[PDB]
């Protein structure tokens, strides 16, 4: 048992017709102090999987090393390491899910919430969640922390059920993700303007976007707000 020290906030994601999108901001908070402003919380594994991690950053870096080591180990005595016997999103997730549940069972958890986003060999979209308790679930949209409360409602308006996935394009899906990231910046006190976004498409492959910013913000109406009730000036 411990407590999280340096922490990362929401990771948000959704499925679309040809793949999956995942995003997370670049902040490493130290309680109320916004300590580290250049933290990458989306970690790609091969060219078909992106693991988005929130919560304790020291445990994130540990998980990052496990995944790095997993790729190395998979390549050993494996002539088809870059083909038929490459790491799948489902393999990577199940491994993490096993570790998370084992660690919680020893009363020494990895203090994280994780979303594994990717595309399988047969082109099927993969999107599944796991956290410090070893709890797992899948959904057309997935989000951690504040994202669960604010991003999911917005993303579910685009893809409300399974049958909405083929009707959703990559442009519409990315637009929804970017809007959600803006809303989180308005309302989450442990978020930053800077974020990373990753698209895993079955046709165009893995597109990893860094140094994105929240833009088109509405603040002008603030000038008209005066006092807390009766004050006019």
């Amino acid at each position: 048992t411990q407590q999280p020290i340096v922490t990362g906030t929401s990771v948000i994601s959704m499925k679309y017709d040809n793949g999956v999108i995942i995003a997370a901001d670049n902040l490493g908070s130290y309680g109320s102090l916004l300590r580290f402003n250049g933290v990458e919380r989306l970690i790609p594994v091969g060219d078909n999987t992106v693991v988005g991690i929130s919560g304790d950053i020291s445990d994130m870096q540990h998980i990052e090393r496990l995944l790095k080591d997993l790729v190395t180990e998979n390549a050993y005595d494996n002539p088809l390491a870059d083909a038929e016997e490459a790491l799948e999103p489902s393999y990577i997730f199940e491994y993490l899910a096993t570790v998370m549940y084992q660690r919680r069972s020893k009363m020494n958890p990895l203090w994280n919430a994780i979303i594994v986003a990717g595309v399988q060999s047969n082109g099927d979209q993969f999107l599944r969640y796991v956290n410090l308790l070893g709890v797992t679930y899948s959904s057309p949209t997935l989000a951690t922390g504040f994202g669960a409360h604010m991003a999911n409602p917005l993303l579910r308006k685009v893809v409300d059920r399974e049958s909405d996935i083929p009707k959703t394009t990559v442009q519409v899906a990315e637009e929804a993700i970017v809007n959600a990231m803006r809303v989180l910046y308005y309302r989450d006190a442990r978020s930053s303007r800077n974020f990373s976004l990753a698209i895993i498409d079955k046709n165009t492959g893995l597109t990893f976007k860094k140094n994105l910013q929240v833009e088109n913000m509405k603040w002008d109406f603030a000038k008209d707000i005066k006092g807390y009730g009766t004050q006019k000036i």
Binding site: G31, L33, Y186, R187, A189, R190, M217, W219, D220, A222
Partner: protein, 196 residues
Amino acid sequence: TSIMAVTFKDGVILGADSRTTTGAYIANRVTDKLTRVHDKIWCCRSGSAADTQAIADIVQYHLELYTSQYGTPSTETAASVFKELCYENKDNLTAGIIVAGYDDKNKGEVYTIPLGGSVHKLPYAIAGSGSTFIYGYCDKNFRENMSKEETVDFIKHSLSQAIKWDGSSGGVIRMVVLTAAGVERLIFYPDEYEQL
């Protein structure tokens, strides 16, 4: 919360962020923490929103009744009424208030009233959770008898940094200018102050 009041040549300027939080949720991103207790006596509020509002409302009532009987009150008098409420009810209040006002005789004055209910007259004052991150900056950059434009830049740069590092601070930077000329409200948006 990041709040400050700075005296300068022509008077005094109050400054504040606009963030109200319930834990990590931002309950209000466009809050007005610069509140009026008299024509040219204002205050910056930090701590409990309910407490500081209740206090400010009572002070405004006291100074309105003071004015009807004895004419315009001094900034020191306003600070004393704040103090009396904060000190005597210290067990039940969480309020960090900066009182700032402009007289013609005394010019610009700033009084800070921290948690205990003590009073401290200062050339400038900083308070709130975000103030911790700008003690170094403000101490190095403050000068007495600055111009209006210099004081605005000083507050803008200071609160920008406080906002940058403090999770409980954010939104727009509100400012209120108190001089002989009158009362001027200023606002500065994220796109402006973040690139500083």
